């Protein structure tokens, strides 16, 4: 479900399946080219599925996997950490905490219909993480935006900093 991690990623269940140097992960269920110490059979509650980066051993450096490079047993994956400071690109995956618009109006909460009735119902689009009243880009807008608490302005883009100047 969530393709980001919090903390050391013990509960990460995303679908990253490469390491941080781009090597495809080995399947946890496979014993070539590496024989795993952590496998679905031995550690069934750690979500060790396909070849997805996981943290079944509470490694302080986060999620990892056995690699398909015979000469490298395992390596850490490069996974996006949850929330923000900033947005990549146009904010398609922006899950940060800014909740006011360009003009400074406080956003209306996604799960509210006041002062603006709308169709962006969280339960309709759970994958879009329309959480509280945070700016989001569920629908390929220029940038994350929200509905506003100003009855006279239905919606407005937000001012989300770019991770790249």
């Amino acid at each position: 479900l969530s393709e980001c991690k919090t903390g050391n990623g013990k509960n990460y269940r995303g679908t990253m399946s490469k390491t941080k140097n781009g090597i495809t992960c080995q399947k946890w269920s496979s014993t070539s080219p590496h024989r795993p110490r952590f496998s679905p059979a031995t550690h069934p509650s750690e979500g060790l599925e396909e070849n997805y980066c996981r943290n079944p051993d509470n490694d302080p450096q986060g999620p990892w996997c056995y690699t398909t490079d015979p000469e490298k047993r395992y390596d850490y994956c490069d996974i996006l950490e949850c929330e923000e400071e900033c947005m990549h690109c146009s904010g398609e995956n922006y899950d940060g905490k800014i909740s006011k618009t360009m003009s400074g109006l406080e956003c209306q909460a996604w799960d509210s219909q006041s002062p603006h009735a709308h169709g962006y119902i969280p339960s309709k689009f759970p994958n879009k993480n329309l959480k509280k009243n945070y700016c989001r880009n569920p629908d390929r807008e220029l940038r994350p935006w929200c509905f506003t608490t100003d009855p006279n302005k239905r919606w407005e883009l937000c001012d989300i900093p770019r991770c790249t100047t």
Binding site: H118, G119, K124, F125, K128, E141, R154, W155
Partner: peptide, 24 residues
Amino acid sequence: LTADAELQRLKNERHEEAELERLS
């Protein structure tokens, strides 16, 4: 009737309405 088709109509409606409220 996919999710993404709905989101696209939703954006289109949001844009259209802003233009109409602009088009004093």
